[PDB]
Structure 1
Amino acid sequence: VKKLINSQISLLIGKGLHEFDSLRDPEVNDFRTKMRQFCEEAAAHRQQLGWVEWLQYSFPLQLEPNRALLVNVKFEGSEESFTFQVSTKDMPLALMACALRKKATVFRQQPEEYALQVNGRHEYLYGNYPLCHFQYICSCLHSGLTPHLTMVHSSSILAMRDEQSNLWSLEQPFSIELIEGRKVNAMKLVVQAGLFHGNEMLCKTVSSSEVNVCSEPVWKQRLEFDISVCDLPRMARLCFALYAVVDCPIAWANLMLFDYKDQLKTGERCLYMWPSVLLNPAGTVRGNPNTESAAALVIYLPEVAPVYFPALEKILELLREILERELYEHEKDLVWKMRHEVQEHFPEALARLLLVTKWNKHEDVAQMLYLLCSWPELPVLSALELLDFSFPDCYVGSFAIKSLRKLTDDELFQYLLQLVQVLKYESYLDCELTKFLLGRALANRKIGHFLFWHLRSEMHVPSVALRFGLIMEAYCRGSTHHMKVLMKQGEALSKLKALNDFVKVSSQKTTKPQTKEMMHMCMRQETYMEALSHLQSPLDPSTLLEEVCVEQCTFMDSKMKPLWIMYSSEEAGSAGNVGIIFKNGDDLRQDMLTLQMIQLMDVLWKQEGLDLRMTPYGCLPTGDRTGLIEVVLHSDTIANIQLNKSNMAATAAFNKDALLNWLKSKNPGEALDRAIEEFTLSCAGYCVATYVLGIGDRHSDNIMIRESGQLFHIDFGHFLGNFRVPFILTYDFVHVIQQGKTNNSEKFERFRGYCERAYTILRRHGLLFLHLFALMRAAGLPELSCSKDIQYLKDSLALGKTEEEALKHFRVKFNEALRESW
């Protein structure tokens, strides 16, 4: 059985556990040891949780950032239900007392024993919050549906919990021996090295002699460095580039100069190199695993007598403000002199001072650290900054995790994406960020859910395979039940990948009706119906994907021929009628990120009382150029609506009418105004989000509308202006805002306000978006690479100007956009 588990993990994580031993690497060993233990202690705790505490682990609350409503409640072991009238202000408990009072009458005769389930979902309503505060009641009110819930008893939830059981001496210059290499090229070879502490180098770089592009090369030279050894900061990273010349790059490689156990390194090292596009401090510090086909440099670290980085005990012994909101040489000096007054009077300026400290003078690091040890904790926003590669020092990083523990789960969920990329910044395997992420992930099943997919989705990337594999194993050890649930998911994705391949081939030999019919047959096979049914949606674990409606599944006509898969649930009703789209052949990362940034805007907007009726649909990469998109139902592209067909509700005299005629046929009588309002509001959000993010190549095929009026965008392969992308106002939306009328500045100008509010709200959190993109640089995304891309955001938010100017500027942009509307 111990064998079984091991083998299911191997299958889950897409790499086999045997490959971890094979390496004969004790760092991997220790990581595997320490992390298993830690994780197992987390599951121990979980099986003693109170029933309510268990619910908070497994089904965390889905909350919003007087008036009457109708609710259906029912009990578990019965089909009989009651419909109570209540107030949106009422707590869940009030409902639960109704229900039981009704039960005790029809059945002829204790609220807190209970939680309410959303029917057909992994979703529960509990806590002291007005019904209307829950996303589910909230949502129910817009669409006009009546919430449906089930009284679940404490014994029934405990039954669930149950089921789920498992030093200063050395003053001479630093040097290595460059010895030999083993690749091929066209013309002379040369090497280049520099000692880096993150971005900043710690001395001028040095070089090789010229060696003809021959071998198999052999240098046997001490490369000597412009820095004394006793100065090397703890996170000294030594970086090599190998290229050729008469500039043509070939390979790079980095290593940490101390091992993971603080011991400085000697003697000889063989270096398996990574392929080129010249010196790459940001690259990983682990060798290329394709040792067969890769160039391997050999070097010799010269045993300097063991030696350890000194323990913290030892380190403990050993016109200001105007600039303080990129500073000159002297400006830096003042800051450093004032460092105690910075700690005492401006603790939030920690970062600007870290960047002034002299990472290549050991004495100064010792003093900086000495301050950091009594530095007050910082706001979440400031902590997010300290995580950047600009702050390699492990003592700073630890302080940043410390400051970040106060992240709520919802906040944590919000920035999870970037915290995983940051892992790519880590120099060793056992690190503060990992324990944190795994700890928080073992405390919340939703966090656990997404950490795992973020990790699984990158197992094809050689530079991260081992790091991520090791983490997913650890999670598994501390959550056997959840591992079974995710295999269920991966098994489904496995089938879609085979089904999607069939469809690509098929669709090149035959007609779309013919191919759809074969898909349906292939899906009807026992192995498929079994693998595609009765799972949690990898896009949102609280969504249950029950029986797949084969007759309703099909495929899109785009290049990669993505799949459209529908699902139903008798137990959830019309709420269990959800759909997912499988796509294989494209990078979904960029789209995912884009979608997370919109969702965040909507959060920030909502927090200031502005609801722009956004449609933040799920989009989740799962594997190599594979992942999942959420089906938004009851929607159609602008392009389709505008085909202006015959024998349709919507055919007018003028192509400009069609889209409004469409809103009309979906919304009879009085209800047309609501839809125009939902259209106007969402239209403003998308105009701002696309403008702020530099998204372009909007056109009527990749914009959609829901029957409610809500407009939203799909298919984002381009942001940050990577084809200055102008703000866009499309004439036919403008026509819808203006309720069909030629002139209507009352409706058109309310629309401008929506835009200006939305825009100015995001400037207030400009720095949260700058920090988040700074951390996304670790993703390797082609369109998020250098400083020019972040500048793009600097300029779109006018984050350097006062709010008078930015708003004035924005107003010129919007006007310009109007000119372009006919």
Structure 2
Amino acid sequence: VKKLINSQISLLIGKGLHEFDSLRDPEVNDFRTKMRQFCEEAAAHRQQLGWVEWLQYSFPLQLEPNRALLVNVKFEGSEESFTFQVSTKDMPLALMACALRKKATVFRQQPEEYALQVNGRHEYLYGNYPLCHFQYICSCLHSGLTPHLTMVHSSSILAMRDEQSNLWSLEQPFSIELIEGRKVNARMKLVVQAGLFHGNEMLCKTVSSSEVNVEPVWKQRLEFDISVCDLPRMARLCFALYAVVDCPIAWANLMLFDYKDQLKTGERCLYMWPSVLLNPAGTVRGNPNTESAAALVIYLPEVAPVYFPALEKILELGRTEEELREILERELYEHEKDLVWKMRHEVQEHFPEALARLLLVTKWNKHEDVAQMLYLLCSWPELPVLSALELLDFSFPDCYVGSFAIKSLRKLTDDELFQYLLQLVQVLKYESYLDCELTKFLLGRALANRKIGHFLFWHLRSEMHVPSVALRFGLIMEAYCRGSTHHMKVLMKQGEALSKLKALNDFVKVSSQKTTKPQTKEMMHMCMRQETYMEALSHLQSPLDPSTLLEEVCVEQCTFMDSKMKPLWIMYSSEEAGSAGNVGIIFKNGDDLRQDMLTLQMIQLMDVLWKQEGLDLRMTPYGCLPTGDRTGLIEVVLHSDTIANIQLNKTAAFNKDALLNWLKSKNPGEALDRAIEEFTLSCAGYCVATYVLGIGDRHSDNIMIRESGQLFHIDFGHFLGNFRVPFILTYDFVHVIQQGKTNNSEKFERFRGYCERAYTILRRHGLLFLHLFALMRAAGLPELSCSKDIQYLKDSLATEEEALKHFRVKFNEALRESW
């Protein structure tokens, strides 16, 4: 029955479906019904896809942004495998051909009927791409390991697709009636400041309430300096309740128009949110804690059925100098703004990419000016992805503006969308109504690609404990589940594994105080070996990456760590995969993993940007994913250790040698020079990464080394210099770069070049970083709160020559400070 699926979605999304009904809201009812059909349409289209098209949905290719190698190939229903010697320039088809020919001669006798599955992973190799373009092959060629693949036939992929089925007339000013208030605070008098906003900008000057002593009654008329006909569609009425002899108490906002474009009237009770003065960026929906939250009773006076005019009507109304207009194009005065508005047609024709600057000069408090702009917009050419990401910020609130940005993001690759998905999910907080183009797009892309679908779910699910977004986020996940009954069940398994891990972590935390670690470890081990634990912790997709399969839990290899939140070290094995199935996951409960994930995503973007310029600084883009309330996962980077642990053996005469001696033991003979190259490149990338991102409090316990020599960072506590952090250079690292030699300028000057190139490449994309950090402000991160945080990134990135010289000033100060 359908009831079991409804109860399944409920337990999964972490909110009962009945709770959407209890509210008795037609906006919630319309979102649910409309979006459900949209997702069921998307689910249907998927079931009739060709086997390759389905493989592109389920297991999208892991691609990279000559030489011969041994590759092991086996067929689905057999233990028999053949090891072939193929090239890195060879296409998957030639490998499939070899695999077929060898099967035909052994068993005594077409490659376009198969696909190559990565052993013990939900990863596949297909398409006209040389084998060296696939991430699994590339990880194998660097680690030395042999790629193990499985020949999967069309009819078997088709069996999966089958078992995975389911107006202008009102010229009087805008006014309201502030009736009465409620709840606590000191003696003093309560003022209610009220303003009207279109994004970050006021449509008129604020009007404050008359001073009333502490449950208060106002019954006062508040009028605004704006005509009702001049109100923009996305106008926000913002309130702030505070005390004065200031002390802020509460805040609440609301759209003057509903989801059906109707100008509201009638009384309204406003369950306000506790303050840290006016917050326009805040949610336009009341506090769900209607019991303990302060309420503002207000009245929307009648003006009578007034609906915001249709596009056909907006377009009906909307239907040199030239030199100084270019000079201001590459924070501006009023005469400069008037010039841009006068020249608005020349902006569309010769500077389409300057649209954002034009959208900020338009008087949104004048319907005629809005119409004249919307008319230009309804003929405006598509903007590049970069400029479109700027148009998603709270500074651009108009619905038609918002719809144009999505229209420019449709061209985005599933790879590019994956990179900025964290920012696009945050932008959901800025949205005014449940039903939006952003949700329809995010949902459309989730259901068209199972990896986008996976991460969109976890981005939403991880924020379910946040009351301001719980309804929106819950509604989106339920809409998703209707479009994928099978994936819903897959994500449910993941939630059961994480449910067991929290209980096991709670036990560990308690036990670590009551007894010694070897005694707590055997108890963890004993608790894990219980039926329910063995079942729940095994045979699941990794929330860190759906292509990674967590098969049998290796209880003996599991442990906990000695740090504050006693994190769990959970290891896995798989016979099929061999070594690819020997993965590990770290479960952390107690700290906020959101920032660590962002820091790692920003470093992952830097890697992508460098790799695109041919520069491979041998980075370690390991997974970090918040899954719940101060709960998350970290990807285990195997064959790695901390600097502090390496600096103590289980032989060095001096500390400076310890690091180099460890590399010497893990990379003997001709391999050592490779490990030092890995160290030099990775070190340089993380020197530019930590510097630009403003990562301080870096020490031996949070910096790690792989047995390959690759250096990487962990447990990023504070970013954007939020303790102006300088460049960091360590004697122990410089020693390794300089090959143990006290003096080595060739090796050090090469390393100085890597730091320089890495820095200059990122400076060219400085706008990409600034747009993504701007969009990220929505998340609520105490380290990305204001413009001074954006300004940190502006200063660490800063003409190319006048900035590169200034980088050398910081680089030289870092080398001299090194003892």
Aligned-pair distance for 1:327? 1.3
**Alignment match of 2:814 (pick from 808, 812, 817):** 817
Distance of 1:66 and 1:537 partners within structure 2? 34
Distance of 2:571 and 2:653 partners within structure 1? 36
Aligned with 1:89: secondary structure? coil
Distance of 1:289 and 1:821 partners within structure 2? 54
Q: Deviations over 1:31-67 (max 9, x none)?
A: 0010000000011111101000000000000000021
Distance of 1:644 and 1:520 partners within structure 2? 28
Could you tell me which runs of 5 or more consecutive residues in structure 2 were left unpaired when the two chains were aligned.
318-323
Q: Which residue of 2 aligns with 1:577?
A: 582
Aligned with 2:220: secondary structure? strand
Aligned-pair distance for 1:325? 2.1
1:90 aligns with 2:95: no
Q: Deviations over 1:782-806 (max 9, x none)?
A: 00010000000000111xxx00011
Q: Deviations over 1:574-607 (max 9, x none)?
A: 1110000101001000000000000000000000
Aligned with 1:175: secondary structure? strand
Distance of 2:697 and 2:235 partners within structure 1? 44
Aligned-pair distance for 1:758? 0.3
Q: Deviations over 1:710-755 (max 9, x none)?
A: 0000001201010010000011000100000000010000000000
Aligned with 2:120: secondary structure? coil
Distance of 2:577 and 2:532 partners within structure 1? 25
Mapping 1:435-446, distance limit 5 Å: 435-446=440-451
CA contact (8 A) 1:177 1:221 kept: yes
CA contact (8 A) 1:458 1:624 kept: yes
Distance of 1:184 and 1:333 partners within structure 2? 47
Q: Deviations over 1:416-475 (max 9, x none)?
A: 000000000000000000000000000000000000000000000000000000000000
Distance of 1:668 and 1:346 partners within structure 2? 59
CA contact (8 A) 1:704 1:712 kept: yes
Q: Deviations over 1:4-26 (max 9, x none)?
A: 00000000000000000000000
Distance of 2:768 and 2:489 partners within structure 1? 37
Aligned-pair distance for 1:333? 1.0
Q: Which residue of 2 aligns with 1:496?
A: 501
Distance of 2:314 and 2:586 partners within structure 1? 56
Distance of 1:697 and 1:90 partners within structure 2? 46
Aligned-pair distance for 1:490? 0.1
**Alignment match of 1:604 (pick from 609, 620, 629):** 609
Aligned with 2:619: secondary structure? coil
Distance of 2:66 and 2:573 partners within structure 1? 35
CA contact (8 A) 1:70 1:147 kept: yes
CA contact (8 A) 1:539 1:618 kept: yes
Q: Deviations over 1:137-179 (max 9, x none)?
A: 1111111111110000000100011000100011111110000
Aligned with 2:325: secondary structure? coil
Distance of 1:720 and 1:784 partners within structure 2? 8
CA contact (8 A) 1:545 1:576 kept: yes
Q: What is the TM-score when the length of structure 1 is the normalising length?
A: 0.98
Q: Deviations over 1:364-415 (max 9, x none)?
A: 0010000000000000000000001000000000000000000000000000
Aligned-pair distance for 1:768? 0.3
Distance of 1:369 and 1:782 partners within structure 2? 36
CA contact (8 A) 1:178 1:299 kept: yes
Q: Which residue of 2 aligns with 1:76?
A: 76
Q: Which residue of 2 aligns with 1:409?
A: 414
Distance of 2:167 and 2:520 partners within structure 1? 70
CA contact (8 A) 1:255 1:285 kept: yes
Identity percentage of aligned residues:
100
Distance of 2:579 and 2:305 partners within structure 1? 69
Distance of 2:330 and 2:620 partners within structure 1? 36
Aligned-pair distance for 1:267? 1.3
Q: Which residue of 2 aligns with 1:177?
A: 177
Mapping 1:111-510, distance limit 5 Å: 111-186=111-186, 187-213=188-214, 216-318=215-317, 319-510=324-515
The more displaced of 322-331 and 114-123 is 322-331
Aligned with 1:190: secondary structure? strand
Distance of 1:207 and 1:721 partners within structure 2? 38
Aligned with 1:719: secondary structure? coil
Aligned with 2:674: secondary structure? helix
Aligned with 1:721: secondary structure? coil
CA contact (8 A) 1:120 1:571 kept: yes
CA contact (8 A) 1:284 1:425 kept: yes
Q: Deviations over 1:746-777 (max 9, x none)?
A: 00000000000000000010100000000000
The more displaced of 255-264 and 321-330 is 321-330
Aligned with 1:698: secondary structure? coil
Aligned-pair distance for 1:92? 0.2
Could you tell me which runs of 5 or more consecutive residues in structure 1 were left unpaired when the two chains were aligned.
646-650
Distance of 1:104 and 1:380 partners within structure 2? 49
Aligned with 2:128: secondary structure? coil
CA contact (8 A) 1:682 1:712 kept: yes
Aligned with 2:327: secondary structure? coil
Distance of 1:238 and 1:477 partners within structure 2? 35
Distance of 2:267 and 2:490 partners within structure 1? 46
Distance of 1:571 and 1:49 partners within structure 2? 29
CA contact (8 A) 1:6 1:17 kept: yes
CA contact (8 A) 1:642 1:655 kept: yes
CA contact (8 A) 1:198 1:281 kept: yes
Distance of 1:718 and 1:180 partners within structure 2? 43
Distance of 1:589 and 1:107 partners within structure 2? 54
Q: Deviations over 1:545-579 (max 9, x none)?
A: 00001011000001010000000000100111000
Distance of 1:49 and 1:28 partners within structure 2? 32
Distance of 2:482 and 2:775 partners within structure 1? 29
Aligned with 1:99: secondary structure? helix
CA contact (8 A) 1:644 1:655 kept: no
Aligned-pair distance for 1:644? 4.5
Aligned with 1:758: secondary structure? helix
Q: Which residue of 2 aligns with 1:648?
A: none
* Runs of 4+ with deviation above 4 angstroms: none
Aligned with 2:74: secondary structure? strand
CA contact (8 A) 1:560 1:583 kept: yes
Aligned-pair distance for 1:643? 2.5
Aligned with 2:279: secondary structure? coil
Aligned with 1:321: secondary structure? helix
Q: Deviations over 1:653-680 (max 9, x none)?
A: 1111000000001111110000000000
CA contact (8 A) 1:66 1:87 kept: yes
CA contact (8 A) 1:569 1:576 kept: yes
Matched residue pairs, number? 812
Aligned with 2:746: secondary structure? helix
Q: Deviations over 1:51-96 (max 9, x none)?
A: 0000000000000002111101010111111111111001000000
Distance of 1:56 and 1:471 partners within structure 2? 23
Distance of 1:208 and 1:356 partners within structure 2? 30
CA contact (8 A) 1:193 1:206 kept: yes
Q: Deviations over 1:173-228 (max 9, x none)?
A: 11100000111221111110100011010111011111012xx1111111000111
CA contact (8 A) 1:682 1:711 kept: yes
Aligned with 1:725: secondary structure? coil
Aligned with 2:525: secondary structure? helix
